[PDB]
Ligand binder design. Structure first.
Ligand code: ZN
Ligand code: ZN
Ligand code: ZN
Ligand code: ZN
Ligand code: ZN
Length: 184
């Protein structure tokens, strides 16, 4: 399968499910505002509960859906200032964040910070797929995904997550769609 332009977004047909694509190559449209995906949200709750039961200090609170308009403001504040290059490196241009899909969620520690502690991060690599999630921005896959590695950013893909995690690949590499940096 190859990506299809469906106007509001590009998507690719996975083994079980349609997979919406949002990255630095394929933006979502300005008007695409699906809010939080309920299926993803219900698995996230379970994921968090299982982390907490394994003893990790993980908050119930998370960063989920973020609209184009909110991302616009957020990206503008970052160029404002840390400059446009720090914005591109650490923020995301509006339309180009997976958070606008409603399928991406950042897990947060009860210490108030995005999860970076090594054992919790590896739990996510090992187990996020049990809840249909993948760790999107893998270590070492910056050229493929376009994004600096993030231990805490999870993307809901559903049943195919286990095969994806076992491959060690980015979604770009796994499904065969384009990634990389902003073309500009
Ligand atoms: Zn639209
Ligand atoms: Zn439309
Ligand atoms: Zn597991
Ligand atoms: Zn790090
Ligand atoms: Zn994120």
């Amino acid at each position: 399968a190859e990506v299809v332009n469906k106007g509001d977004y590009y998507s690719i047909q996975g083994k079980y499910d349609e997979i919406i694509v949002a990255n630095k190559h394929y933006p979502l449209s300005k008007d695409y505002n699906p809010g939080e995906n309920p299926t993803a949200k219900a698995e996230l709750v379970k994921l968090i509960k299982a982390m907490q039961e394994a003893g990790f200090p993980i908050s119930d609170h998370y960063s989920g859906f973020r609209s184009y308009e909110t991302q616009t403001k957020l990206y503008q504040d970052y160029v404002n200032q840390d400059g446009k290059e720090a914005a591109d490196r650490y923020s995301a241009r509006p339309g180009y964040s997976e958070h606008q899909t409603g399928l991406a969620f950042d897990v947060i520690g009860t210490d108030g910070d995005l999860v970076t502690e090594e054992k919790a991060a590896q739990w996510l690599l090992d187990h996020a797929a049990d809840y249909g999630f993948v760790v999107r921005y893998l270590k070492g896959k910056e050229k493929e995904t376009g994004y600096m590695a993030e231990e805490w950013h999870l993307r809901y893909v559903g049943k195919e997550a286990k095969e994806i995690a076992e491959s060690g690949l980015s979604l770009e590499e796994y499904y065969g769609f384009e990634g990389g940096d902003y073309v500009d």
